Amino acid sequence: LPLDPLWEFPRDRLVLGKPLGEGCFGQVVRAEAFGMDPARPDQASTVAVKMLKDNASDKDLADLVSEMEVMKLIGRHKNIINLLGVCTQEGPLYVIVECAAKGNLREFLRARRPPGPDLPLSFPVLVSCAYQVARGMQYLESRKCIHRDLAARNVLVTEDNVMKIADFGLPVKWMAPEALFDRVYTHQSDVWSFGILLWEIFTLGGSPYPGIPVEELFSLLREGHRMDRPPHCPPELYGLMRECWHAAPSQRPTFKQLVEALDKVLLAVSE
Numbered sequence: 001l002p003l004d005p006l007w008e009f010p011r012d013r014l015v016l017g018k019p020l021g022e023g024c025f026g027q028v029v030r031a032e033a034f035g036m037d038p039a040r041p042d043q044a045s046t047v048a049v050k051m052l053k054d055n056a057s058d059k060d061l062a063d064l065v066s067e068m069e070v071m072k073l074i075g076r077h078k079n080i081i082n083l084l085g086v087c088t089q090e091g092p093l094y095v096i097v098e099c100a101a102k103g104n105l106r107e108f109l110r111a112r113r114p115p116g117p118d119l120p121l122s123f124p125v126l127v128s129c130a131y132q133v134a135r136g137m138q139y140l141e142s143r144k145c146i147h148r149d150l151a152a153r154n155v156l157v158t159e160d161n162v163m164k165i166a167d168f169g170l171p172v173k174w175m176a177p178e179a180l181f182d183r184v185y186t187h188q189s190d191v192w193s194f195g196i197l198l199w200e201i202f203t204l205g206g207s208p209y210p211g212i213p214v215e216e217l218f219s220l221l222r223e224g225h226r227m228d229r230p231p232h233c234p235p236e237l238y239g240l241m242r243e244c245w246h247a248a249p250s251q252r253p254t255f256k257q258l259v260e261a262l263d264k265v266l267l268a269v270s271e
């Protein structure tokens with residue numbers, strides 16, 4: 001494996017810990033890195049480390065190398081999981097990335113749901129979550145990157161409650177129609193998923209198309225039907241969800257427009 005002077009981190013400055021909230025990102029452990037911030041080379045920081053299983057194939061290795069190479073070119077953004085360094089020489093490949101201690105957005109909202117039945121996570125807090133994801137997506141789009149699985153489960157939450165998009169590069173209920181069986185994947189198909197993600201945010205980690213079996217979905221969408229306004233959702237946000245769900249990909253808003261619209265709601269929204 002080649003040595004990249006810009007990214008190589010010494011493995012003896014990395015002490016591996018417990019797996020990160022169990023498998024959903026394929027062999028990721030929490031770790032303590034020493035001198036990750038070169039200003040204070042003595043200082044310890046909590047990081048995430050992606051590696052391969054002992055049973056991994058040649059393809060599995062090439063896939064991790066490709067992911068590492070894409071993360072080297074993407075640059076930095078506060079609302080994405082950023083590459084911190086790599087351990088490639090004299091040992092197994094280690095991909096050091098940012099740690100999001102509070103886990104995925106879905107579980108984050110589900111745990112903060114109001115107890116008991118309807119007869120602590122206000123609208124500005126929810127719009128903040130959405131705005132942050134839209135900004136991370138607008139960034140990734142500018143770096144020629146299409147997600148392919150933009151769901152609340154792929155948005156990670158840090159100790160500082162910052163939203164971070166993970167796993168950028170079937171989850172049928174988040175997929176745009178043109179990707180369902182024409183098998184596309186564009187920036188417009190990411191906007192469709194962003195609309196489903198808005199619905200998950202305002203339902204506080206609710207499962208989309210509740211009750212509808214995965215096979216009945218394609219017909220539902222072909223008839224022009226979409227999910228109804230969640231019980232506690234600002235009308236402007238349902239309007240945005242509906243624009244993300246246009247059948248024609250060219251009719252959907254761009255992540256730039258979504259950022260603009262989400263900002264106005266963030267400033268104005270009550271409750």
Ligand SMILES: *CCC(=O)Nc1ccccc1C(=O)Nc1cc(CCc2cc(OC)cc(OC)c2)n[nH]1
Nearest residue numbers: 020021024048050098099100101103104166167168
């Ligand atoms: C199942 C998801 C989940 O909820 N996980 C979780 C639960 C409780 C606490 C923490 C977590 C968690 O997964 N934290 C976490 C993972 C990561 C890095 C994941 C990752 C993302 C990439 O994006 C392209 C790339 C790589 O490595 C190549 C790893 N950080 N914090």
